[PDB]
Point group: C5
Chain length 52, copies 5
Amino acid sequence: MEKVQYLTRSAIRRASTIEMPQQARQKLQNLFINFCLILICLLLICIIVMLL
Amino acid sequence: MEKVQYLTRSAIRRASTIEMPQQARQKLQNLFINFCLILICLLLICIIVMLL
Amino acid sequence: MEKVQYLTRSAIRRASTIEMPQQARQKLQNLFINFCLILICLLLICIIVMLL
Amino acid sequence: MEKVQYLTRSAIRRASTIEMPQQARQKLQNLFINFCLILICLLLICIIVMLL
Amino acid sequence: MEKVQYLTRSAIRRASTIEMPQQARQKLQNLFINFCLILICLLLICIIVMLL
């Protein structure tokens, strides 16, 4: 191998300044974007409800 | 093989906490983003219509 | 081959419920996102113009 | 080769209806998205400044 | 090798007009998008607070 041990070791070395179960990081970025859009939705609606 | 059986098995094991036909997950993330933009569009327009 | 004929056939089979020249689908997703941002721009500006 | 000449030729053939230095296209899509978010930021702020 | 030296050299040559620690560029694009969504959130909320 060597190539894998070098890649995995490179990550663990540069990721020593993080505290997440990995899955959270990936799921967060994607799920967040989607959630954000939905959030902006309900938001604009609220503003309108106030204008009425 | 072995590499495939390991990858596919790894997914089915970590995806046991989900209930979607796969296609929905992928199509949702992409289609949603696009739909969100359109949604924010009509939204800002509505707000303006109220200000008039 | 076999691998290609299987992949291409898998798409044509699952894409039988679509009606686009392919290029439109790809260009739309990307171009749309970009266009959406621009759209939200001019939108917020319009709202402000009304508040003045 | 043959595979490369076919891929590169396929692009130049389908990209004959474009006028950009390539780098602009890529940098634009990414930089634009980022810029758009910033733009929407200052925008919402402006609206608020008017409400005050 | 040759292929690597050509790729890495091609980047350093086209990236001579930049001043970032690399990691910042990648982390910025992703983290920014996410941050932007959150930003637009608190923004719409502020506007509403003013309408009340």
